[PDB]
């Protein structure tokens, strides 16, 4: 009659993520996640601590995918075909349209870092997504005649959700990345007062209480009025359109003339990602981009897409433009170590390119995280708006959670577990 | 249908080109192939009779019943011998029997009254015994034009 939980990933870290939940009769895997920055089997979670039974499909019942960021849905094609699992996978609707692209893109980094030893091939992408059974928001869906889930709306990325798992008398709500301060990007997370037995949340930005759009625009405008170039790495999707729409609206209100470019290649969702942008909540200045005019004189803004400064476009275009004083680069996202996007953001400007050659740097470097998260204000407000019986912390760090639990159990007087990477945590009802 | 406009208005205020009647305006928008939802679904009056006499000879066309009310075999019968396909895929959003068992165990009614078509399994599928409404105490049933006494005493 208990409810077991175990953060097989996301345990006091922002890397892996895999929350294995066991409700009274069934098992459910939540947010089957990945971890970049590695190059062997140690990137995917350790599923071997589930297979100490018959194979999976007898054990689990449904896997859930909160959003499309690579740290929650970047392991399905290894978990659905290699370890073996033929059971329904419940995503949201936009994530089933995005996650194939982000996966098929991450694979490019993988097979290029020569780490395809135990990996998922392109065929497995399709042969995994064919096991998806999408759900629609606020519209519960039933499996096993006793396991009913229900969606929500939390934002931070087009397609995210906060899922709710029910077996009748008891239930567990799980929240991925949510945002409570209603920034004009997607909206504020709205959950109904279901009063559930367990609520899990993320703690990315905990120990901190709009200026981003301001200073980003100011810096771009300054470096573009001097004949100087910009660089802004971004995935094939995700944080690219929340930048394109910003540049567009700021520009037609300022009537500039500088060529803007966003070259994905993997998809032209510069005019399609907007399609799915509507049912939840097409360009003028933006052209296509290729290798030809990444060198011509004139102010420029370039959006490349290997990821956090891996091999591909960004690394090359950057390696060209390092020897210039007026250009600048911004990294609107976290960076994983072992990547030049981690050398640059923290100090180092004396790099060493292919071979023993030496590259200098004279540009500017900026870190204006355009991510969407919540913090103590919004987290307290949401756990109040939910009235749980326990709150769990994942996708964060050690000391922020350790300080947060004090206030959480202090103000609202509610128990809050802080499980490490793999400890069982049981909560009885 | 002669009630198209008010129908769509009352669906909205609470591609599909509706028309008041096959005679008049409609005969100037007829582009084949097409799709034509029509009047009463017992294939015995309205407009559907006219098409079912128009397309009842070409093995290409198709009728697709979406109403469980009228048994479809006899319904289609008096246009035989017909050479058009006739699919039967009924859409019933009503409570099915496992759901009504769960609903009864939830609401816990002290009794139940259901027509005779329920407390015994359906006739066509006599071998099943799970589509009978299972409830305790046994569900008192009624037959056509009967006078039951719900056994409560004040």
């Amino acid at each position: 009659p208990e409810i077991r939980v175990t953060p097989l990933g996301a345990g006091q870290d922002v890397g892996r993520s895999c929350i294995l939940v066991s409700i009274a009769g069934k098992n459910v895997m939540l947010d089957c996640g990945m971890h970049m920055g590695f190059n062997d089997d140690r990137r995917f979670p350790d599923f071997s601590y589930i297979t100490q039974n018959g194979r999976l499909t007898d054990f689990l019942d449904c896997v859930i995918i909160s959003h499309f960021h690579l740290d929650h849905c970047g392991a399905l094609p290894y978990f659905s075909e290699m370890v073996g699992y033929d059971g329904p996978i419940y995503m949201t609707h936009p994530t089933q349209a995005i996650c194939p692209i982000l996966l098929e893109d991450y694979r490019k980094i993988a097979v290029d870092k020569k780490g395809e030893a135990n990996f998922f091939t392109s065929q497995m992408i399709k042969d995994c997504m064919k096991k998806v059974v999408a759900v629609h928001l606020h519209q519960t869906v039933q499996v096993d005649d006793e396991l009913e889930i229900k969606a929500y709306y939390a934002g931070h990325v087009l397609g995210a959700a906060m899922f709710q798992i029910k077996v009748g008398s008891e239930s567990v709500v799980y929240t991925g990345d949510y945002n409570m301060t209603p920034d004009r990007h997607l909206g504020a997370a709205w959950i109904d007062k279901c009063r559930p037995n367990l609520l899990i949340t993320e703690s990315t930005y905990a120990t901190t209480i709009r200026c981003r759009e301001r200073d980003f625009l100011k810096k771009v405008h300054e470096t573009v009025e001097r004949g100087g170039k910009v660089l802004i790495p971004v995935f094939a999707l995700g944080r690219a359109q929340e930048l394109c729409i910003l540049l567009e609206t700021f520009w037609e209100r300022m009537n500039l003339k500088v060529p803007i470019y966003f070259s994905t290649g993997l998809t032209e969702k510069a005019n399609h990602y907007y399609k799915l942008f509507i049912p939840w909540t097409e360009f003028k200045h933006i052209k296509a981009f290729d290798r030809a005019f990444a060198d011509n004189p004139g102010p420029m803004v370039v959006f490349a897409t290997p990821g956090m400064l891996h091999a591909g476009q960004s690394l090359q275009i950057f390696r060209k433009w390092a020897g210039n004083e007026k250009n600048m680069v911004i990294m609107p996202g976290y960076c994983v170590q072992g990547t030049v996007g981690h050398k640059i953001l923290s100090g180092q400007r004396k790099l060493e390119m292919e071979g023993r050659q030496v590259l200098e740097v004279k540009m500017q470097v900026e870190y204006m995280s355009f991510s969407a998260h919540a913090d103590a204000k919004g987290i307290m407000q949401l756990v109040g708006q939910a009235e749980p019986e326990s709150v769990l912390l994942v996708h964060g760090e050690a000391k922020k959670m350790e300080f947060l639990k004090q206030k959480i159990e202090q103000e609202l007087r509610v128990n809050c577990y802080m499980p490490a990477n793999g400890e069982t945590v049981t909560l009885p009802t | 249908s002669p009630v198209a406009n008010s129908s769509l208005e009352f669906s909205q205020i609470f591609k599909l080109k509706h028309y008041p009647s096959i005679h008049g305006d409609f005969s100037n928008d007829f582009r084949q192939p097409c799709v034509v939802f029509t009047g009463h679904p017992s294939l015995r009056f309205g407009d559907v009779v006219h098409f079912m006499e128009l397309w009842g000879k070409s093995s290409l066309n198709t009728v697709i019943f979406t109403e469980p009310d009228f048994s479809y075999l006899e319904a289609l019968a008096p246009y035989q011998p017909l050479a058009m396909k006739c699919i039967y895929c009924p859409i019933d959003t009503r409570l099915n029997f496992i759901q009504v068992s769960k609903l009864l165990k939830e609401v816990q009614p002290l009794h139940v009254v259901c027509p005779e078509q329920y407390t015994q399994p359906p006739p066509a599928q006599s071998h099943r015994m799970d589509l009978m409404i299972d409830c305790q105490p046994p569900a008192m049933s009624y037959r056509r034009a009967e006078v039951l006494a719900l056994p409560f005493k004040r």
């Binding site: 970049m36 329904p88 032209e268 170590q337 953001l345 991510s371 490490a420 | 015994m129 799970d130």
Partner: protein, 718 residues
């Protein structure tokens, strides 16, 4: 090691032992310890300590600063573990009792850092990494380590329990190479197996089933003859204590000719007669896997395996333990039948299969189960009625049933069985209310069945006529999973049945291709991809719906489109055509000059593959090279050699090696051999076969990236 990184060691050691600089990062420590593992264990580990008296500084400060952050001391502990590998290094690090210091109470063993599982896991990994010589085992014995490990292998983090069990088995397997440590391990295992705490006894069983199977020295059986009473008598409690682990222990002890030499098979039989119908299944399966077994026990096993199907077929129209669970609920019954079908199919392809392997009864039971689950069977008893009323409209049962019923292809027999099985698969395809996770397995199984029937036969055309009006409906299902599976099945046929004019009569008479030809405008990309590959594997036969009117569609999908998958699949289809032999110059030109400027990488790779195929097929050297230059292969080659993406460069340098050797075997020939021989290949071959992160994973680069902490970096979604 290496000087270029050696000069960085002191500063990074200082920033490690100093906490005023911000905290370190996990992956940094991990890759750095990996570099240590690969630099030390590959050579002497004492001379590196002698030349660099700086690591010893870290390993001495770790037990003195008393305020190490959560993670730095873990790296230090794993480092002290990987250093103390050789006895000489053990003694060198023993200068000052450093090893008994940090792996003892002076270290983190007692201090209030016993909270983060990472430090404990590092401690255990280090201990296992050092215990490779009898001196270290004597250390563990006299100093005392197993005493604390016993307590440790009970905590709440499986990442520590598993490692603890592995550490026990390693120190054991090194001990007897009865010593005090080995005898204490044995006594602890025994006195734990006779206990009544489920986690403790589970640990005992798993340490036992690793010890056995991972080692087979004479003491293994000399110890199993001792345990066999204690293990066997565990089957006295009404609930079996650790079911799965017990099954695994039996399955590992049994698969050895040593332990088989009397109580083994007898206690396995007692188990088979005792274990409930949730864990007896896999045990009996593992038994039947074994080549050697007293055949009566194999009869018992295979019969208690076949119990569910030969039980169901006494509840339809052609012991009670299993039929009890068959009537318990919808979860338990579906689970039991799915496990039984999974097992019973896992057994078929084996040569140690029983004799005679039943085929009539198996297939009959399987088709009965599938049809019953569809919802049109005919019960003949109360159990048949309730079963038809519980299994109706399921998936797991139906899915695994399709998997079995398709596994039955290696089973030889008359066409009667083939038609029996098709007569239910055809029904399962056109069954309204069939999820997209069912039609796929259904199509796979229908294919395996249709491709194993001993021109064609007397029933193939009849079944095809009855089937294509189902391949014409499920090809427009409103959920792209079906719209893809149907096309894939059509492709499997178009590859296996392209030279059978009767099958072609069936297909052309149907209206399948006039729908595939239209699907290439479906919105969802994967649909377009599978549609293009289907129409490709089709038009290599001459089955076009009422070739250029598809080539134009293909090249149009290739020039502009909103996705990747269609382009990288149409390139595959073009490769198929150009390899088979289904103007050729202009064709290769209009595909290459419009595949080059495409931005994706897979497309350019497949383009290089197309070019390789064409070159090999066309290779008189003068005019051959003139033709090969007309398409502009050299342009694409010397254009995307120094390419952004590396796999492109790998394919290109391979192609250029091919071209170079092939012209060596035999613009102008002198001009082209010059402009090819001017650049380098072998050095380029090396720098491209290298990794993309060869620099940013090197030890020196990692040291730079580590000791330079203190900039903007926090962590966030990728």
């Amino acid at each position: 090691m290496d000087p270029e990184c050696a000069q960085l060691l002191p500063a990074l050691c200082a920033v490690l032992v100093d906490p005023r600089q911000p905290v370190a990062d996990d992956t940094c420590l991990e890759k750095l310890l990996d570099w240590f593992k690969t630099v030390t264990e590959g050579e002497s580990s004492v001379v590196l300590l002698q030349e660099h008296p700086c690591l010893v500084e870290l390993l001495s400060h770790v037990l003195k600063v008393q305020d190490l952050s959560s993670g730095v001391l873990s790296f230090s502990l794993r480092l002290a573990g990987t250093f103390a590998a050789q006895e000489n290094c053990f003694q060198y690090l023993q200068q000052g009792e450093l090893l008994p210091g940090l792996f003892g109470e002076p270290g983190p063993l007692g201090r209030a850092t016993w909270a983060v599982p990472t430090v404990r896991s590092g401690w255990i990994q280090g201990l296992r990494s050092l215990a490779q010589h009898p001196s270290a085992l004597r250390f563990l014995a006299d100093h005392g380590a197993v005493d604390t490990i016993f307590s440790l292998q009970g905590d709440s983090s499986l990442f520590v329990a598993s490692a603890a069990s592995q550490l026990l088995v390693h120190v054991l397997a090194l001990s007897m190479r009865w010593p005090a440590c080995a005898q204490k391990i044995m006594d602890h295992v025994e006195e734990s197996l006779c206990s009544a705490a489920t986690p403790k006894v589970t640990q005992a069983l798993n340490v036992l089933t690793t010890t056995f199977g991972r080692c087979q020295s004479p003491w293994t059986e000399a110890l199993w003859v001792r345990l066999s009473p204690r293990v066997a008598c565990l089957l006295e409690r009404d609930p079996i204590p650790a079911a799965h682990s017990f099954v695994d222990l039996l399955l590992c002890v049994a698969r050895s000719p040593v332990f088989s030499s009397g109580s083994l098979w007898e206690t396995v039989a007692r188990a088979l007669s005792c274990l409930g119908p949730t864990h007896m299944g896999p045990l009996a399966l593992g038994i039947l896997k074994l080549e050697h077994c007293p055949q009566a026990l194999r009869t018992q096993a295979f019969q208690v395996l076949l119990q569910p199907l030969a039980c169901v077929l006494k509840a339809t129209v052609q012991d009670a333990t299993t039929v009890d669970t068959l009537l318990a609920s919808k979860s338990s019954c579906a689970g039991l039948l799915c496990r039984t079908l999974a097992h019973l199919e896992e057994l078929q392809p084996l040569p140690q299969r029983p004799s005679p392997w039943p085929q009539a009864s198996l297939l009959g039971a399987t088709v009965t189960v599938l049809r019953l689950c569809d919802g049109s069977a005919a019960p003949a008893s109360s159990v048949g009625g309730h079963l038809c009323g519980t299994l109706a409209g399921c998936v797991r049962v139906q899915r695994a049933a399709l998997d079995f019923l398709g596994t039955l292809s290696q089973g030889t027999g008359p066409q009667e069985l083939v038609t029996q099985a098709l007569a239910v698969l055809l029904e399962c395809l056109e069954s309204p209310g069939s999820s997209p996770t069912v039609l796929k397995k259904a199509f796979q199984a229908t294919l395996r069945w249709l491709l194993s029937s001993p021109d064609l036969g007397p029933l193939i055309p009849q079944f095809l006529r009855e089937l294509f009006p189902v391949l014409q409906k499920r090809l427009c299902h409103p959920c792209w999973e079906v719209r893809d599976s149907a096309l894939e099945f059509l492709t499997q046929l178009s590859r296996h049945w392209g030279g059978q004019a009767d099958f072609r009569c069936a297909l052309l008479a149907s209206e399948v291709p006039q729908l595939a030809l239209q699907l290439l405008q479906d919105p969802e990309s994967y649909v377009r991809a599978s549609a293009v590959t289907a129409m490709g594997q089709l038009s290599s036969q001459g089955l076009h719906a009422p070739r250029q009117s598809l080539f134009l569609e293909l090249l149009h999908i290739l020039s502009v489109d909103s996705e990747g998958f269609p382009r990288r699949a149409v390139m595959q289809v073009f490769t198929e055509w150009l390899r088979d032999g289904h103007d050729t110059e202009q064709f290769v030109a209009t595909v290459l000059q419009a595949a080059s400027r495409d931005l994706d990488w897979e497309v350019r790779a497949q383009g290089l593959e197309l070019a390789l195929v064409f070159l090999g097929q066309t290779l008189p050297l003068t005019e051959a090279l003139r033709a090969l230059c007309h398409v502009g292969l050299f342009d694409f080659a010397f254009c995307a050699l120094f390419d952004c993406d590396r796999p492109v460069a790998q394919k290109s340098c391979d192609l250029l090696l091919f071209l170079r050797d092939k012209i060596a075997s035999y613009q102008e020939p002198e001009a082209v051999l010059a402009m090819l021989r001017s650049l380098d290949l072998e050095g380029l071959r090396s720098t491209l076969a290298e990794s993309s992160d060869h620099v940013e994973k090197s030890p020196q680069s990692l040291l730079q990236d580590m000791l330079a902490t203190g900039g903007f970096l926090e962590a966030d979604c990728y």
